[PDB]
Amino acid sequence: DRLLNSSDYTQASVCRECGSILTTQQSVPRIGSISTVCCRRCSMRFEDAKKGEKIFIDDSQIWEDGQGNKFVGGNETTTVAIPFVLKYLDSELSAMGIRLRYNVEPK
Amino acid sequence: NENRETARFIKKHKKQVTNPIDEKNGTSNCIVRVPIALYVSLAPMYLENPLQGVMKQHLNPLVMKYNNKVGGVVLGYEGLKILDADPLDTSEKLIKITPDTPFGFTWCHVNLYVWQPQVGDVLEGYIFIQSASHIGLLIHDAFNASIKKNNIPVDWTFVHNLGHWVDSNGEPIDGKLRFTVRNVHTTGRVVSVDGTLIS
Amino acid sequence: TFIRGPICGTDNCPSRLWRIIDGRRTCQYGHVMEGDVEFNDDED
Amino acid sequence: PEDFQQHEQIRRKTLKEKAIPKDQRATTPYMTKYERARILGTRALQISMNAPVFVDLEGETDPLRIAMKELAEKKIPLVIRRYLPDGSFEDWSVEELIVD
Amino acid sequence: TTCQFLTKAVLDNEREQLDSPSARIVVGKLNNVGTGSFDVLAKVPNA
Amino acid sequence: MYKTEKVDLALNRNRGDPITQHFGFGNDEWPKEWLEKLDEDGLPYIGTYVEEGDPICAYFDDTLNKTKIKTYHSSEPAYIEEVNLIGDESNKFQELQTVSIKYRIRRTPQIGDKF
Amino acid sequence: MMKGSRRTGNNTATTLNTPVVIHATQLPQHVSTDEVLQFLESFIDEKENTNLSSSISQLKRIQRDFKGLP
Amino acid sequence: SAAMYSRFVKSALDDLDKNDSTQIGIIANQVALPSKNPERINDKNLNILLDILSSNINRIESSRGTFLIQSIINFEKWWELPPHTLSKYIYFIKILCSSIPKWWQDVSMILVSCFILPIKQTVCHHDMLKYFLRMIPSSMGFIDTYLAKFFPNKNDTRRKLVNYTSNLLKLRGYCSELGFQIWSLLIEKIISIDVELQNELIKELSTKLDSILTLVSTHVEEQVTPESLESGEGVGVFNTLTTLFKTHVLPTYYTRSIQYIMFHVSQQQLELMDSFLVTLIDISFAVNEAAEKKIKSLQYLGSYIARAKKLSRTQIIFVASYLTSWLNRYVIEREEEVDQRGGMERFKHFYAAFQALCYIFCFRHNIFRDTDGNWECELDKFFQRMVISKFNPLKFCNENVMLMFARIAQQESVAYCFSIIENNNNERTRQQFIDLQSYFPYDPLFLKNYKILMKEYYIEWS
Amino acid sequence: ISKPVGSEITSVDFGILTAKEIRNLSAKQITNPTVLDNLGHPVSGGLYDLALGAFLRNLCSTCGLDEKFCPGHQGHIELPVPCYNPLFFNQLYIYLRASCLFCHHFRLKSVEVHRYACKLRLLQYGLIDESYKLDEITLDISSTLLNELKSKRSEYVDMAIAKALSDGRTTERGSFTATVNDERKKLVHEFHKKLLSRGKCDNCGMFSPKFRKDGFTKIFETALNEKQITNNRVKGFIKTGSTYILSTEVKNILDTVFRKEQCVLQYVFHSRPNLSRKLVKADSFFMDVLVVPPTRFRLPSKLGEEVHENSQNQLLSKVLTTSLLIRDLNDDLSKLRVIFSRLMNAFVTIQNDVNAFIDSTKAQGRTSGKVPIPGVKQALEKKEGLFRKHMMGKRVNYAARSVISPDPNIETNEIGVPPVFAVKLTYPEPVTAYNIAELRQAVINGPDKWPGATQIQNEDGSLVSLIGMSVEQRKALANQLLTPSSNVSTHTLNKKVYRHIKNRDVVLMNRQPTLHKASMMGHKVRVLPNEKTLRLHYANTGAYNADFDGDEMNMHF
Ligand SMILES: [Zn+2]
Ligand SMILES: [Zn+2]
Ligand SMILES: [Zn+2]
Ligand SMILES: [Zn+2]
């Protein structure tokens, strides 16, 4: 009760491949599309699409930001419950250059 | 170096089971069965009737929406199979309450039937109406399709009014039409379908 | 008592604000503004 | 499709490992005063959310006092998962224990 | 000496299992002592 | 109990800064019930029951054209005991930018008050 | 604000909306017209004995698509 | 301007192989003018311009192609086009289903926002629904839920409310496959106004309940007809109201003026009432039900019988074939816990229904005579036996309902418990037993206007 | 509890981010150090960019959301020099002082390194005794024969683990026990002593002089004493005192060391067994590109009628001004002495600002500036900081403190509560069919009379208050509780009317010196009218050890 449920009860989003909390992100949709949740470091831009005879996509990893960059990657997230200060430490561990590659068990 | 890491991406999107051109109708086969595993959140109020709670809360809003995991519009389901957390089949199975909620989560096997559009497919469905630059269709009385003049040859003109079609035989075209499917675009909530005609 | 400032959500109208519990600010009808941060500092 | 087959086969066999059945279970046949807490929390936490109440509640508004009316009659449908610090476990129903 | 250990723990590649109460609180996990050492599971009457 | 409070506009005012804001109301406004706590110079009646949320002085600036009153910055039922209109030193003639205001917090012996 | 707050209802995905992990346990296997129309005869007979009133009609159109005429 | 403006916008048609978007943001912005502005488009440049739009979409469509499609869909008062171009403007929205299967979202934003406007204003939208909802199955979700997103505000006038209800009632007669939610959004949000009037028992709210709910009771009266019960779905409308009355209105406290919608429908024939009260036997007498969700239905049943005119006299004995037969079961089983040391607080279920049987007896008195001077199953002997028992029901019934049980049983010589009524001064938590012995679900209604529809089918005093 | 949580976290990993994946996650690098100008503007390409979350009530670039819903983001900074992380100059200096700068190896032996290589392979599983018996199984230095000794030790260890994996002793995940962890700190600390002290190399006779450091900036190749200069060339046949070495030349040494002696360092760093086989390189020691914290974690403080600048933007722009200057000084020596003395001083103010971004007790600086401006190590090292300050010592909602008082008319398991407390503390009570007799009267009262409620909660999550209403709307909404939602996701979730605190709620209590744990107990609340302090019984005050001199005891509902 007194360290999560009544101080900083936060339900963030965790990418279940790279293991982060900050770098998840609600997708800025196309004007008829639906704002999903896409990560950052699992997401590579669409430019890396070298070459079955083609590399066609089934409309899964294709998301854009408010900047408009087509990224391919970054899906498969979920909802956890962390204290917010953990998210603050994760930035301050990133400031040192130290990640927190988590594990999230329903997979 | 970067030749076996690309196989993480080539195996990522490409679906395995194709749509073979079956019974020589011109149509391929696109209704396909696959079994899955959910991860439900059973209600406390559906403790007495836990089969009705899994279906109503997670399976009745599952049909007739495009699903990004199977890659298909979920047509229908049948046959829920709630697992157990006691590895002892029988009636009184037992599920695991989350420590902070009264909501207890578990595993379920269930069987789905979806629709499978791909590239390189050729299908047949009724045309509803048309224009002088696009022609829209219906497939299986559930599925749209649109064929536009950038998929249509040059000599197919247009009798003008509802204005009908003029092919190289000079006839307004019928309902059912053979067509080759282009990239499917799921931008709207309604599943939009693109298609071509030339080989 | 209301200020010249931002418009927010809760779908009342283009609205205005004022603080009631000093940092969980609300609209006219007491609807909670979702997620303010309320910068402060303690002295000694 | 194929690598979740190499993921549920491994896990549920590993889940099948550390179970200790009704003949091999040799921990205490008592309700160890924290079991009585977390039952009376989570049973009362379900009854707040319109879970079915297997007792004749007669003018009680508190989920806690309602849940202490089902424990007095051994009605609570929970199974206690007593872990052991190797990882193993023994599964215990509310009916087969003695409330002090 | 917080970052003195944090020096070595990243030098350790320490897959911390979050089983001490001075670590389950850091991630806000349910603590493993008392009413949190054991799970509570609901036996539904129907298949 | 008693306590006094400095009301300083010159704490913000620089040396060559002109005399910008002035005690009293102005124009392009009419917020009422400030006239029920304050007097025409924007300094309150002595002996008027103030609280938190209540205007304590009206200084109408001329760079924003609105009376931005400040407020009694405590949580106890006070009054105003006496107000002093404080002049300035380096000149003889400019308007005041320093007021002192004396408060009368009454404190009966409630339960807990030590003997 | 005005556009960012109603995006909680855009996704509207609690745990009472979506399953958490969706893993196809096996391979996709195609179902023929004699199997689909027998599936659609079986399953739609079950959900007609609540909501889902919209998608039942949507599957009746696919049902009549393999037995009748538009 | 005759054919000049056709080649003028045929040069704006050329923006697929020229890609400059010069003339895109002028005329579509000129048609983005408001409807009361006399600077905007006429009807002559309405024809051939949209023939470029109906017959061509490939030479427009991009992210830039959104612009000249937004301002044409969102053209307000779009039925104020000439009928020789209403054929053409629909012919652009016809192909809008077929151009890109996404933009049907955007018209349905405006179809339901014009449900505020009446049938005499917006009759053309009903022809668009049946001719295209058959076409598009995979959109029925936000069709069903935009009656809540485009829902009228709670403090509207009647002009936004008397006509929004008219788009809901006419439409299911030709959209008979969308489903359950259509009827429910009335009963859901009739109670937003219902509870805001009996706490006020200024006159904005009453005519929302008088004359706009009049349309609700009129349309459902037209859905029960002697051919929809024989071959149509007059029982289907009875189905979707039977499964709805048990959800939104019965568990809510102190709820008048709304249950008449159920009360007006199932009063016609022998079929609907012999499936609505035998359903209520499964409600108000089941052991598996909650014993605190049964006092109100045994109070709801009590005032249905003595306030409904079109029920047969052999159907009222059908109540006393089971309600008095329910007292053929308490007489054997549970007359033996009183000598066990316990008060009568456990039997608040038992005196709940026993009020309702005396609530019939305080009203139905001149019905069950014969020529031979008898009564149906000895009516002047049943209330003698169950009152002089060892339960003392005179204290656990209300004084007003025993003021009226006494004067009736004195004139016709039914009961003579008068000296035991007098013996309750030296005989005598509590609030849940006085209110429900005075809450009657079929009170004589304060509304004078709805009683036009319910002059006969609701009983007067005598 | 009507906002449930799905998946959950169980374990944490560590390790150092690549130079590559800081760019894969964030290509929004920053070049403008000047943060705010006239009209207070957040410049794009500066530290307060909108691409790192929204700021000043704007909308975010990449989140697309307001300042209230964006988390902020990260942003790299291109450092053209290898600024090493100052928390790793301990390690790389020690791996330098054995890495022979001539033979591209250590000074050590082939098999002496292999012993500590092979024993840590045994100490990453649940086996210690075979790590000692590995030293037992051994056998004119002829390396033609001693490859059999290489073929003998690990061949057992190929099968000693395979013997152990045949048991239920260890798995390939490994086994990490304190007694395994205790002996792991006995190889490595002894492994980090003889490497630190060697005369020559072994596979050659050539070697380097003593590296001498300074306060975590400079690295010197000192003047070799005149006995040992000849000792490189009397074997090698068949500049001034303390020559400075820089992190580019240091990275030149650390290429063929982590490449060639990889098998040892695969197990020294990775305590657990390696299910990832990523190679060990010096790029994890150095910070090749930095990161920028979110906007929400970087705004300047404010007090009084003022604003006070953050720590981590003064010393983040001072990086970038040096990043400006080290970009500006590029063409000067690129188009032609003392220009190198102008150049070498640019590798200190870029060194002292990765030193000041992270540390502040490890920075030289200028003066002693009244506990100077912190890095991020100093944000984490005191009683204050973060862990004891706001991770162990989290301040709580729904909590009060007051002055205790005697009262002998309450039960010993109780507390007396004033109506001042009794109209503020709320309990999120969900609605059912048994509490509806009370929760309807809770909304009628509101926060005016005590048996009441403050705000309610529909099936959406709306906190519709009850302050502005009156007996019209308060009687109306109480019957708006049992009306279920036609939103399909919200048909289980019932409504949570936040009532007040009643006569039946039980509440923690807390003296501020809690030495025995019985200073922290729980009490049935009895709400006492006509009061302004807590009321305690004498049975309690022998347990809390709090006499009635007026002590501030906290209270937690
Ligand atoms: Zn990541
Ligand atoms: Zn709103
Ligand atoms: Zn962003
Ligand atoms: Zn060598």
PDB file of N, CA and C and ligand atoms in Angstrom, chain C residues 9-13 31, chain G residues 6, ligand 2:
ATOM      1  N   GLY C   9      -8.241  19.088 -21.590  1.00  0.00           N
ATOM      2  CA  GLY C   9      -9.192  18.069 -21.981  1.00  0.00           C
ATOM      3  C   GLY C   9     -10.440  18.057 -21.125  1.00  0.00           C
ATOM      4  N   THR C  10     -10.913  16.833 -20.827  1.00  0.00           N
ATOM      5  CA  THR C  10     -12.154  16.436 -20.141  1.00  0.00           C
ATOM      6  C   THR C  10     -13.421  16.775 -20.931  1.00  0.00           C
ATOM      7  N   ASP C  11     -13.251  17.418 -22.097  1.00  0.00           N
ATOM      8  CA  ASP C  11     -14.304  17.707 -23.079  1.00  0.00           C
ATOM      9  C   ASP C  11     -15.476  18.486 -22.481  1.00  0.00           C
ATOM     10  N   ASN C  12     -15.144  19.512 -21.701  1.00  0.00           N
ATOM     11  CA  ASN C  12     -16.134  20.510 -21.324  1.00  0.00           C
ATOM     12  C   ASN C  12     -16.284  21.543 -22.434  1.00  0.00           C
ATOM     13  N   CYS C  13     -15.202  22.269 -22.723  1.00  0.00           N
ATOM     14  CA  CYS C  13     -15.112  23.357 -23.689  1.00  0.00           C
ATOM     15  C   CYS C  13     -13.636  23.722 -23.808  1.00  0.00           C
ATOM     16  N   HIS C  31     -13.046  18.160 -12.411  1.00  0.00           N
ATOM     17  CA  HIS C  31     -12.509  17.014 -13.129  1.00  0.00           C
ATOM     18  C   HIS C  31     -10.988  17.059 -13.104  1.00  0.00           C
TER      19      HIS C  31
ATOM     20  N   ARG G   6      -8.512  11.644 -24.797  1.00  0.00           N
ATOM     21  CA  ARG G   6      -9.456  10.675 -25.336  1.00  0.00           C
ATOM     22  C   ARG G   6      -8.777   9.540 -26.091  1.00  0.00           C
TER      23      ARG G   6
HETATM   24 ZN    ZN J   2     -16.329  16.271 -21.696  1.00  0.00          ZN
END
